[PDB]
Amino acid sequence: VFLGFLGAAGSTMGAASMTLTVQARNLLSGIVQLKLTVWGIKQLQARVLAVERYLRDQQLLGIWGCSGKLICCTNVPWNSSWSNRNLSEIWDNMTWLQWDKEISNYTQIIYGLLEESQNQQEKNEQDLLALD
Amino acid sequence: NLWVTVYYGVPVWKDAETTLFCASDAVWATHACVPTDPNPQEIHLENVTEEFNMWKNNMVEQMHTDIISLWDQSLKPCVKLTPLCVTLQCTNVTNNITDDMRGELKNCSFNMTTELRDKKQKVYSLFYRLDVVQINNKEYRLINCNTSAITQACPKVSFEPIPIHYCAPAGFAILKCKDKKFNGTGPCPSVSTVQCTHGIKPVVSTQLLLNGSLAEEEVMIRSENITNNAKNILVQFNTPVQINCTRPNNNTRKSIRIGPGQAFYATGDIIGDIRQAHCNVSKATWNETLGKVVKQLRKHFGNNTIIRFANSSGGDLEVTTHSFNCGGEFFYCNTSGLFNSTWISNNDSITLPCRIKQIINMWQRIGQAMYAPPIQGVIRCVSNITGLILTRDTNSTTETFRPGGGDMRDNWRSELYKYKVVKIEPLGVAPTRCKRRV
Amino acid sequence: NITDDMRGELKNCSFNMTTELRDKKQKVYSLFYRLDVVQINNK
Ligand SMILES: *[C@@H]1O[C@H](CO)[C@@H](O[C@@H]2O[C@H](CO)[C@@H](O[C@@H]3O[C@H](CO[C@H]4O[C@H](CO)[C@@H](O)[C@H](O[C@H]5O[C@H](CO)[C@@H](O)[C@H](O)[C@@H]5O)[C@@H]4O)[C@@H](O)[C@H](O[C@H]4O[C@H](CO)[C@@H](O)[C@H](O)[C@@H]4O[C@H]4O[C@H](CO)[C@@H](O)[C@H](O)[C@@H]4O)[C@@H]3O)[C@H](O)[C@H]2NC(C)=O)[C@H](O)[C@H]1NC(C)=O
Ligand SMILES: *[C@@H]1O[C@H](CO)[C@@H](O[C@@H]2O[C@H](CO)[C@@H](O[C@@H]3O[C@H](CO)[C@@H](O)[C@H](O)[C@@H]3O)[C@H](O)[C@H]2NC(C)=O)[C@H](O)[C@H]1NC(C)=O
Ligand SMILES: *[C@@H]1O[C@H](CO)[C@@H](O[C@@H]2O[C@H](CO)[C@@H](O[C@@H]3O[C@H](CO)[C@@H](O)[C@H](O)[C@@H]3O)[C@H](O)[C@H]2NC(C)=O)[C@H](O)[C@H]1NC(C)=O
Ligand SMILES: *[C@@H]1O[C@H](CO)[C@@H](O[C@@H]2O[C@H](CO)[C@@H](O[C@@H]3O[C@H](CO)[C@@H](O)[C@H](O)[C@@H]3O)[C@H](O)[C@H]2NC(C)=O)[C@H](O)[C@H]1NC(C)=O
Ligand SMILES: *[C@@H]1O[C@H](CO)[C@@H](O[C@@H]2O[C@H](CO)[C@@H](O[C@@H]3O[C@H](CO)[C@@H](O)[C@H](O)[C@@H]3O)[C@H](O)[C@H]2NC(C)=O)[C@H](O)[C@H]1NC(C)=O
Ligand SMILES: *[C@@H]1O[C@H](CO)[C@@H](O[C@@H]2O[C@H](CO)[C@@H](O[C@@H]3O[C@H](CO)[C@@H](O)[C@H](O)[C@@H]3O)[C@H](O)[C@H]2NC(C)=O)[C@H](O)[C@H]1NC(C)=O
Ligand SMILES: *[C@@H]1O[C@H](CO)[C@@H](O[C@@H]2O[C@H](CO)[C@@H](O[C@@H]3O[C@H](CO)[C@@H](O)[C@H](O)[C@@H]3O)[C@H](O)[C@H]2NC(C)=O)[C@H](O)[C@H]1NC(C)=O
Ligand SMILES: *[C@@H]1O[C@H](CO)[C@@H](O[C@@H]2O[C@H](CO)[C@@H](O[C@@H]3O[C@H](CO)[C@@H](O)[C@H](O)[C@@H]3O)[C@H](O)[C@H]2NC(C)=O)[C@H](O)[C@H]1NC(C)=O
Ligand SMILES: *[C@@H]1O[C@H](CO)[C@@H](O[C@@H]2O[C@H](CO)[C@@H](O[C@@H]3O[C@H](CO)[C@@H](O)[C@H](O)[C@@H]3O)[C@H](O)[C@H]2NC(C)=O)[C@H](O)[C@H]1NC(C)=O
Ligand SMILES: *[C@@H]1O[C@H](CO)[C@@H](O[C@@H]2O[C@H](CO)[C@@H](O)[C@H](O)[C@H]2NC(C)=O)[C@H](O)[C@H]1NC(C)=O
Ligand SMILES: *[C@@H]1O[C@H](CO)[C@@H](O[C@@H]2O[C@H](CO)[C@@H](O)[C@H](O)[C@H]2NC(C)=O)[C@H](O)[C@H]1NC(C)=O
Ligand SMILES: *[C@@H]1O[C@H](CO)[C@@H](O[C@@H]2O[C@H](CO)[C@@H](O)[C@H](O)[C@H]2NC(C)=O)[C@H](O)[C@H]1NC(C)=O
Ligand SMILES: *[C@@H]1O[C@H](CO)[C@@H](O[C@@H]2O[C@H](CO)[C@@H](O)[C@H](O)[C@H]2NC(C)=O)[C@H](O)[C@H]1NC(C)=O
Ligand SMILES: *[C@@H]1O[C@H](CO)[C@@H](O[C@@H]2O[C@H](CO)[C@@H](O)[C@H](O)[C@H]2NC(C)=O)[C@H](O)[C@H]1NC(C)=O
Ligand SMILES: *[C@@H]1O[C@H](CO)[C@@H](O[C@@H]2O[C@H](CO)[C@@H](O)[C@H](O)[C@H]2NC(C)=O)[C@H](O)[C@H]1NC(C)=O
Ligand SMILES: *[C@@H]1O[C@H](CO)[C@@H](O[C@@H]2O[C@H](CO)[C@@H](O)[C@H](O)[C@H]2NC(C)=O)[C@H](O)[C@H]1NC(C)=O
Ligand SMILES: *[C@@H]1O[C@H](CO)[C@@H](O)[C@H](O)[C@H]1NC(C)=O
Ligand SMILES: *[C@@H]1O[C@H](CO)[C@@H](O)[C@H](O)[C@H]1NC(C)=O
Ligand SMILES: *[C@@H]1O[C@H](CO)[C@@H](O)[C@H](O)[C@H]1NC(C)=O
User: Fold this and answer.
1) Three-state SS for A89?
2) Alpha carbon of C2 to those of B150, C5, C6, C8: distances in Å?
């Protein structure tokens, strides 16, 4: 069922995952459509910042070997120190906003391993499987 | 065991400021602006709650400075009135004897430089005594000439407030609470979101708020700090209070070619119903609404206190009286006729005397000034009073309140409190039972 | 200070200056360095 932009924002993370694309589209949006003038360089600046805003994180997903995004798995195990809750305590009983409230503390820390571990090791390995 | 799983398109956001841009339909300053959608979208968000804070909402700051920028840009390509700064030879104007009008204008004459830079021309024009001042018939001076230069507003451009919509760029969301209750800040049980804001007219006024939005339920009292009388109070009405203001002067525009090339619009002759401009207010309506306001006040000060209303502390006319624009003309009205009452412990119509100025200073800004051209013919208009800008004045019962203003960011804030801007963060991660194979 | 070690270097110049009252002018004065000004053609 089509809910609308951010229509699942007020639901559990499990439920919300159903309709990530409805949001995804408008993360970059597009369209929009005497010189200078007020707004003359503001629509300019804003529309630029939108593009940068998008790609800055998209590239990270490019690095984190997935690309086929919205959702993908890794080979990095979850450290229990990063909010030790059960799946039903998390996915079936918590919104994404509530999630960030806690996990945001380890953002860069988790990014470390995502930015690396697998990306490093998945490769070489393959290069070696190509030996024969 | 659980693993790190990567998610994208996550419905989360952080409070953040970015560069907003306008939209409005397809006069004032708006043309270079993206047309609005024929179907503005929205969506109520169920289970979503969070805090608002109108007192730190930087949307106001941007809007304020943007409007200022627009103002200047609309004047640069217009005619400068630099050579008007000359000694004026002025005399009283014999209005219908004896003297009810008090003159208020002088039949000034002066040697003016014309298109023929060389031979000058003795001309005349009617000026308000609020615009000119005696030097040292008698000699007079345009008041602006002691502070800065003055520019004539183009006769083609208008000042009619036009509904403007604000939009955020992709990655940013416009959040809008629909909660009829709001203290000025805190959590809202009922939050929605929109593509863009509703049309807001850039109405400049002091003391009284005009042509704004209406409140639901009861009268709304909002203040950064009610107990702190160094702050002020925003009052939003529930029902439009009609005010009808008139300038009964079918006057002409003896335009004078003080070139070269560029033309000046002087004041011709004043004929017709020589009465002072004034405003008409429905008295019973005012009394009724004021009472509703006092009810609120009772609710934040006690069920055994006394409420008195009075005029300002005086001083700068711009703050002392109610200033507003109608059709290009600038009015200054004595709101003592409104703000003069009291309430205990637990037609009819009102006439408000007004004055007309032609030299004005916007947004408390010094260093420049703008000359309003006289508008030909009788000028009369009507608007909706939709709120008050009040200030809080042996402190155990009787309290006195009075009208203020000055800082016009207050006006924008009186509307934008319904909105806030947040930055979406699409990228998130979470623990999920999944080990990824090659 | 007599006699003359400073060599002057500045002149006590005066002139009919246009003021805010574009019309009646005002005789004023100002000290200028002789590196800034040059004789035309007191002088
Ligand atoms: C709170 O909100 C309210 C509601 O919005 C505001 O109230 C409005 O205030 C504005 C002024 O700010 C008023 O605008 C005036 O409207 C006049 C009426 O025009 C209509 O009737 C005439 C007469 O038959 C028709 O010809 C018109 O039709 C045409 O125009 C429309 C729109 O462009 C077109 O779509 C049509 O196709 C027609 O072409 C209208 O139906 C209007 O006459 C008047 O315009 C004159 O004055 C302006 C300056 O104000 C001049 O720039 C302009 O040139 C006009 O002057 C000519 O006509 C007069 C007539 O006597 C002559 O004297 C002049 O010499 C000259 O020839 C103006 O646009 C509006 O009426 C009013 N609305 C309401 C609901 O009452 C409040 O302003 C606001 N409060 C505050 C604080 O601002
Ligand atoms: C908004 O939050 C409310 C809770 O505050 C969520 O309410 C849940 O709504 C659904 C739909 O009405 C209910 O699900 C239905 O429950 C019955 C019985 O359990 C089951 O037979 C149906 O198959 C269905 O699941 C759910 O019980 C109800 N929860 C509670 C606490 O009453 C709603 O889901 C929230 N919306 C968002 C987008 O998260
Ligand atoms: C511009 O208007 C001014 C008045 O606002 C006119 O001023 C007049 O200027 C002349 C020349 O300076 C004065 O004339 C001289 O007066 C003295 C004494 O009366 C007389 O001795 C001289 O022979 C001569 O006439 C005149 O008095 C002065 N008027 C006043 C009111 O001070 C000026 O003429 C105007 N220019 C134009 C083009 O009309
Ligand atoms: C305001 O001052 C102006 C001058 O700055 C006065 O202008 C005078 O206005 C009257 C009426 O338009 C003119 O009178 C008419 O002149 C013609 C020709 O001389 C004559 O045929 C008519 O019988 C009539 O008198 C007068 O000439 C004009 N003066 C000039 C200098 O143009 C006006 O009177 C002043 N108003 C006040 C209340 O004093
Ligand atoms: C709302 O703003 C008002 C004023 O802007 C704040 O009032 C201030 O409240 C404190 C606590 O009652 C007063 O501090 C006390 O003052 C006495 C004398 O100066 C001193 O002896 C104490 O050590 C203490 O500092 C303060 O004077 C009072 N200010 C005024 C103008 O009366 C109130 O705190 C504000 N509320 C919010 C939430 O910030
Ligand atoms: C608002 O209305 C009040 C009256 O309700 C006006 O009060 C007047 O305020 C001025 C300034 O404080 C007082 O003027 C001063 O009076 C003393 C003595 O007469 C004199 O020595 C000073 O030179 C000066 O004029 C005035 O007396 C006071 N009137 C009364 C009845 O107390 C105030 O002017 C009003 N504001 C507006 C904008 O009209
Ligand atoms: C706004 O309108 C009010 C009337 O609605 C005007 O009130 C007048 O205010 C002045 C200053 O407070 C009063 O003048 C003082 O009166 C006493 C006694 O007559 C005299 O002793 C003082 O020397 C001084 O003139 C005046 O009486 C009062 N008028 C009435 C009807 O109470 C006020 O002037 C208006 N403001 C504007 C800008 O016109
Ligand atoms: C501005 O300063 C200049 C000097 O730097 C003043 O010049 C004076 O101008 C008047 C008018 O051109 C001259 O007066 C005429 O002189 C002749 C001969 O002495 C006499 O025949 C006439 O009756 C008349 O007085 C005057 O000589 C000239 N001074 C010099 C030094 O050349 C001018 O007056 C100043 N303006 C202001 C407003 O003070
Ligand atoms: C530089 O030239 C200026 C004029 O451009 C000369 O100005 C003169 O300065 C003196 C000292 O400030 C003034 O003298 C005083 O005048 C008052 C009133 O006349 C008198 O009460 C005092 O006893 C004293 O004399 C003089 O008036 C002023 N002149 C003018 C035109 O304002 C200054 O003297 C020049 N310096 C050199 C070294 O020549
Ligand atoms: C999970 O990450 C935490 C840090 O977030 C690691 O914590 C270390 O734990 C050991 C054992 O208690 C201590 O010696 C270290 O000093 C802790 N580090 C800090 C920052 O407190 C823990 O090692 C991590 N587990 C995995 C498997 O790497
Ligand atoms: C113009 O008329 C005003 C009155 O409308 C006169 O005002 C007088 O001005 C003098 C000087 O300021 C005061 O001494 C009087 O008290 C003022 N009268 C009043 C009623 O306030 C002024 O004299 C008039 N000018 C002409 C040339 O007659
Ligand atoms: C610039 O002119 C204004 C008047 O146009 C002068 O304002 C006066 O300022 C003093 C001091 O604040 C007040 O006593 C007067 O009441 C003011 N007059 C008015 C009309 O408000 C100001 O003094 C002038 N500046 C210069 C340098 O002369
Ligand atoms: C906005 O409402 C909040 C409550 O929702 C008010 O918070 C009170 O603030 C004062 C000052 O910090 C504290 O003394 C109270 O204990 C707070 N109340 C609670 C519930 O925490 C705040 O006063 C309100 N603002 C307006 C203008 O009324
Ligand atoms: C004054 O505000 C009232 C709202 O209280 C406006 O009322 C509208 O009036 C027109 C004409 O009767 C109707 O078409 C609308 O449906 C009314 N709105 C509602 C809420 O009832 C009126 O337009 C306002 N005037 C000004 C100039 O804006
Ligand atoms: C002031 O007194 C009034 C009654 O005169 C009180 O009114 C109550 O207000 C609350 C909030 O609106 C309602 O829940 C009650 O039902 C009202 N009572 C009645 C009689 O209508 C109000 O509580 C009083 N304020 C103070 C501080 O005590
Ligand atoms: C303030 O408004 C009151 C009315 O609300 C005005 O009261 C008048 O006061 C004078 C002096 O006491 C009496 O002559 C009138 O009869 C009073 N009117 C009534 C309705 O009682 C008072 O004039 C007002 N003040 C201002 C400055 O206008
Ligand atoms: C994990 O959930 C189980 C029930 O599924 C519960 O027994 C245990 O308490 C939970 N974890 C936490 C930290 O309590
Ligand atoms: C995250 O840690 C910061 C201090 O680094 C702290 O202020 C905040 O409370 C922490 N959040 C969690 C959920 O403990
Ligand atoms: C306003 O009406 C209230 C009663 O609703 C009354 O107490 C007060 O006298 C009234 N004011 C006017 C001017 O009649």
Assistant:
1) helix
2) 50, 8, 10, 11
> Of A5, A6, A16, A1, which is closest to residue A93 (Cα–Cα)?
A16
Name the method of structure determination: cryo-EM
Pairing outcome for strands B349-357 and B359-360: unpaired
Stated as kind and residue range, the H or E segment containing A31 is none
Cα of C26 vs centre of ligand 12, distance in Å, is 21
CB atoms inside a 10 Å sphere around CB B253: 16
**Minimal Cα distance from B83: which residue of C?**
C22
Encoded amino acid at B175, one letter: L
Task: Tell whether the torsion through CA atoms of B12, B15, B19 and B20 is positive or negative.
Answer: positive
- Collect all residues with Cβ–Cβ distance below 8 Å to A18 and sequence separation of at least 6: A8
Distance CA A34, CA B30 (A): 12
Least Cα separation, residue B173 to chain A (angstroms):
10
Chain B interface mutation, best of A72, A78, A126, highest count of B Cβ atoms under 10 Å: A78
Pick the closest to residue A20 from B175, B430, B168, B41 (CA basis): B430
Strand partners, C14: C29
Phi-psi category of residue B211: left, alpha or beta, with phi > 0 → left and psi -120 to 50 → alpha: left
- B401 CA from centroid of ligand 16 (Å): 18
d(CA B308, CA B344): 9
B292: which residues sit within 8 A by CB, 6+ positions away?
A: B218, B219, B238
Cβ pair B19, A49 in contact under 8 A: yes
Q: How far apart are CA C30 and CA C13, in angstroms?
A: 6
Name residues whose C-beta falls within 8 Å of residue B166's C-beta, 6 or more positions apart in sequence.
B20, B21, B22, B23, B59, B63, B174, B196, B197, B200, B419
3-class secondary structure for chain B?
CCEEEEEECCCCEEECCCCCEEECCCCCCCCCCECCCCCCCEEECCCCCCEEECCCCCHHHHHHHHHHHHHHHCCCCCCECHHHCCCEEECECCCCCCCCCCCCEEEEEEEECCCCCCCCEEEEEEEECCCEEECCCEEEEEHHHHCCCEEECCCCCCCCCCCEEEECCCCEEEEEECCCCCCCEEECCCEEEECECCCECCCCECCEEECCCCCCCCCEEECCCCCCCCCEEEEEEEEEEEEEEEECCCCCCCEECCCCCCCEECCCCCCCCCCCCEEEEEHHHHHHHHHHHHHHHHCCCCCCCEEEECCCCCCCHHHHCEEEEECCEEEEECHHHCCCEEECCCCCEEEEEEEEECEECHHHCCCCEEECCCCCCCEEEEEEEEEEEEEECCCCCEEEEEECCCCCHHHHHHHHCCEEEEEECCEEEEEECCCCCC
Q: CB B63: neighbour CB atoms within 10 A?
A: 22
Distance B280 CA to ligand 15 centre (A): 36
Half-sphere exposure of residue A56, counting CA atoms within 13 Å on the CB side? 11
Residues B183 and B53: beta-carbon distance below 8 Å: no
Query: Given the structure tokens 């024009």, which residue do they identify?
Result: B125
Q: Which of residues 78-97 of A touch B (CB under 8 A)?
A: 78, 82, 87, 90-91, 95-97
CB pair distance less than 8 Å for A71 and B5 = yes
Say if residues B115 and B89 touch (Cβ distance below 8 Å).
no
Residue B4 token pair: 């790190």
